Design a protein around this nucleic acid. Structure first.
Length: 437
RNA sequence: GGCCCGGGGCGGUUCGAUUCCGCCCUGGGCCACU
């Protein structure tokens, strides 16, 4: 409980055992043969090609190199023919461009078509940049593969390992650039403790500077930020995590935390103690990939949060959860109920025109003067957070994300109390309210 | 699909909106999947 001690024991969790290695090697062997019998020009890339893949994440990436002149359609058609002839089982997949995923001797394989080019310039799509990323990394990360694995294991165990929207963490590529930069997991963790939201790490220049945002420049393109999708808060969590690790090394930082399920009854009591209004907007999950849905859940969540603050319900925090079946937007407010009346600021007394206009409005309670200007008492259409949101969501469904909104437009409800504690959101609620133990 | 910058139109709210809440056209940049 020295560092060195823990890291040795940690390699145990991050490095693939001999069976997983062999299993992959054997598949690479077969995959090459099958590809050669067809005489296809390919190149293995990704963490597998560079022996940096984390334990239990064995997947082989094979990029097909096509002449700079082929049409985008040739690549897809030809790419599909090859993946389809070479894989034990396949399944077309999509993204920037379509490609084929599948299996071979029991291991996940991605057969991706891209253009074979020289010089990062003339890149038509991200998939074309991948080969250069691989070439830059292959000779430089050799020997530090386990350092990469410790870093990956660390991030994964703390819920910030991938760069996709459901996570907004650190991509695999980013991890390797960091190891290349600092030389090891420890040096990376030691220095990350000094990272700021203004830090800029330029790998190719072997330099660190102050910029306008956290930026890790791509060795293959200076203009690209490899950490582009690492959220501000996730950056912070990492920095904090490193400080804590160096202050008290523990194998715990590499072991996923137990969901720590709680009994709803206890949750009910805690919410009672807090005296807040806790509720959730429930609707049906649109049939879209997490990549389109999560940013939508974030938007919808925010727009409602903002509605809650300007409408003065004093929201504390918000959260959200997606199930196979529905999606939940969670909220906690300090105000369970507010009065019907509120005061509206009017014009300064000297402004006769607007004053006369301001008094023309027929109201229930007769305006008054205070510190030089007129004020009027007004009445709200709703006096509870749940009421406001029911109103907001029913009329502002369109500003809650193209799909999420369209779904809420056809059906939503607000849940609170016992009926809420029964939904698959109890874990998100504890996290949101800082429940501990 | 989401986010950033910019234009052309509107609706609602308000004493008063370019400036609050939103809606259509629309130009550029960027992010995630591969």
């Amino acid at each position: 409980m020295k560092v060195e001690e823990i890291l040795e024991k940690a390699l145990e969790l991050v490095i693939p055992d001999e069976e997983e290695v062999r299993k992959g090697r054997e598949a690479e062997e077969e995959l090459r043969r099958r590809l050669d019998e067809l005489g296809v020009e390919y190149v293995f890339v990704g963490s597998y090609a560079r022996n940096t893949w984390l334990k239990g994440s064995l997947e082989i990436d094979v990029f097909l190199l096509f002449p700079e002149e082929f049409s985008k359609e040739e690549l897809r058609e030809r790419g599909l023919e090859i993946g389809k002839a070479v894989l034990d089982s396949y399944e077309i997949r999509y993204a920037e461009h379509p490609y084929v995923h599948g299996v071979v001797k029991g291991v996940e394989v991605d057969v991706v078509p891209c253009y074979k080019l020289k010089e990062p310039k003339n890149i038509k799509s991200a998939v074309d940049r991948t080969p250069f990323h691989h070439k830059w990394l292959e000779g430089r990360i050799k020997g530090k593969e386990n350092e990469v694995r410790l870093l990956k294991g660390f991030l994964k165990a703390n819920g910030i390992y991938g760069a996709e929207y459901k996570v907004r963490g650190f991509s695999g590529y980013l991890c390797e650039l960091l190891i290349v930069f600092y030389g090891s997991f420890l040096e990376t963790v030691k220095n990350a403790r000094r990272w700021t939201r203004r830090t800029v790490i330029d790998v190719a220049k072997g330099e660190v500077r102050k910029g306008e945002e956290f930026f890790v420049v791509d060795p293959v393109d200076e203009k690209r930020n490899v950490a582009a999708n690492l959220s501000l808060d996730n950056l912070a969590r990492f920095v904090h995590l490193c400080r804590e690790f160096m202050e008290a090394p523990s194998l715990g930082f590499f072991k996923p935390k137990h969901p720590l399920e709680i009994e709803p009854e206890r949750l009910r009591k805690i919410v009672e103690e807090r005296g807040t209004a806790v509720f959730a907007v429930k609707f049906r999950k649109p049939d879209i990939v997490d990549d389109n849905l999560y940013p939508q859940l974030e938007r919808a969540s925010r727009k409602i949060f903002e509605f809650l603050e300007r409408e003065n319900f004093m929201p504390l925090r918000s959260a959200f959860k997606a199930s196979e079946e529905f999606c939940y937007l969670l909220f906690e407010c300090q105000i369970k109920e507010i009065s019907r009346v509120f005061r509206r600021m009017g014009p300064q007394f000297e402004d006769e025109r607007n004053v006369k206009k301001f008094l023309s409005r027929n109201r229930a309670f007769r305006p008054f003067i205070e510190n030089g200007r007129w004020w009027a008492f007004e009445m709200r259409k709703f006096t509870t957070p749940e009421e406001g949101v029911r109103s907001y969501a029913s009329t502002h469904w369109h500003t809650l994300g193209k799909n999420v909104g369209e779904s809420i437009r056809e059906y939503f409800e607000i849940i609170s109390g016992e009926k809420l504690f029964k939904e698959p959101v109890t874990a998100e609620l504890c996290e949101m309210m800082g429940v501990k133990d």
